[PDB]
Structures are given as structure tokens and as C-alpha cells.
Write a protein that binds this DNA or RNA. Structure first.
Ligand SMILES: [Zn+2]
Ligand SMILES: [Zn+2]
Ligand SMILES: [Zn+2]
Ligand SMILES: [Zn+2]
Ligand SMILES: [Zn+2]
Ligand SMILES: [Zn+2]
Lengths: 86, 84
DNA sequence: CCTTGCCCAAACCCCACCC
DNA sequence: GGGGTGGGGTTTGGGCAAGG
């Protein structure tokens, strides 16, 4: 029908479903390699793209061995999650 | 009627044929205005509305003369097939 | 039975926002 | 040579049964 919170007209009900997920902070699609979750499956696919591409180098973390396809992303992960021992 | 591949029981045999097309991969219904093909005639009927409706504005591709109903789809098609 | 249209989740993609 | 996420939107695949 219509957005019960913001009153936005949607031509598709699935888009209204994901919009209501954004309003309610619902993230059903959770990553299996970290704590990240998102409201859309395509978001999860794009996120898993950052955990290492097929045929590409992977920078595993020194602490929890979390895979990353970009060194800067691994550095950010270490700075954000592994500051308990600095 | 039960699927010979996954064993799903249907209350309608035509549903079994359409579902089995997913296992076999056959796509009998092929669009005449693009490369799209599907296993269900109704899906092709729905897809044909992306090329435009009678009386509505239609954006035809400048190179391959492919009609479109949504300019966003036309832009995506131009990026996909015409990088020159 | 067979058509067909609807419902919903899922795919793909573009653009804007963030750290 | 930035890399990744959130919002937004078209389109598509799978399913299902009411009514031809
Ligand atoms: Zn809303
Ligand atoms: Zn992750
Ligand atoms: Zn780590
Ligand atoms: Zn099957
Ligand atoms: Zn087509
Ligand atoms: Zn074209």
C-alpha cells in the first residue's frame, strides 16, 4: 500500500518492504564471516566481495584471521576491532 | 505428479512442467525484441512490458533500435552493449 | 487440465553518503 | 589508482491457484 511511517508512494511492494526494513533497522541478511548485516541480499553479496575475490590475493587478519581483499580495509578492521591490545 | 529431479509434489501438472524447466534449463519462451528467454509464458508476457505499452512513451535505443519503457533500463542497456 | 496474473524474495545496478 | 556502505529502483525467478 503506502509507507506507514513516512507516507511514500511505492509502485512495488518489495521496495516498500526494504524501505520499512530501513525504517525499522531490520538487517535479515547477516554475513557469515563477520558481524555485518544488511537489509538486502545484494548488499550482502557486495559485502562478501570485500572478503576476497576468486583468483585474487587475500590479506588475513593477524588476530582473528578475518579475510580481506584490500590491505587498507584490514587496517581499518584492526583499528576498529583489535584496539583492546594497543 | 512429482518432480523427477527434486521430488516436489504439485497439485497442478503444468506447474510441474514449468518447475522442471528450471532443472532442465530449457527456455521455450524467447523475447523477439531482446535476448531474454524464460520457462514460463506469463513471464515473457510480463517482460514484454519493459519494451513499452501502446500509448505510452517509448525510448528506442539509438544503435540497435531496441525499444524500452523505462529510460533507466535504456541507460543500463547502452552501458552493457554499447561502450563505443 | 492449462493460462495467466499476482505475490514475494532475489538479482543487478546506479547514485549518494561515510570513514 | 579509495574502499565500502546505505538508499533507491528496475527487473527477474519461483510458486500457486482461480478461473479460462
Ligand atoms: Zn518510509
Ligand atoms: Zn563480512
Ligand atoms: Zn581481525
Ligand atoms: Zn524439481
Ligand atoms: Zn525483451
Ligand atoms: Zn542498443
Amino acid at each position: 500500500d503506502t509507507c506507514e511511517y513516512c507516507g511514500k508512494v511505492f509502485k512495488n511492494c518489495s521496495n516498500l518492504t526494504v524501505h520499512r526494513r530501513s525504517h525499522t533497522g531490520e538487517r535479515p541478511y547477516k554475513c557469515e564471516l563477520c558481524n555485518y548485516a544488511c537489509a538486502q541480499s545484494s548488499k550482502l553479496t557486495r559485502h562478501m566481495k570485500t572478503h576476497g575475490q576468486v583468483g585474487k590475493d587475500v590479506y588475513k587478519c593477524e588476530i582473528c584471521k578475518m579475510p580481506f581483499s584490500v590491505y587498507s580495509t584490514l587496517e581499518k578492521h584492526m583499528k576498529k576491532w583489535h584496539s583492546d591490545r594497543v
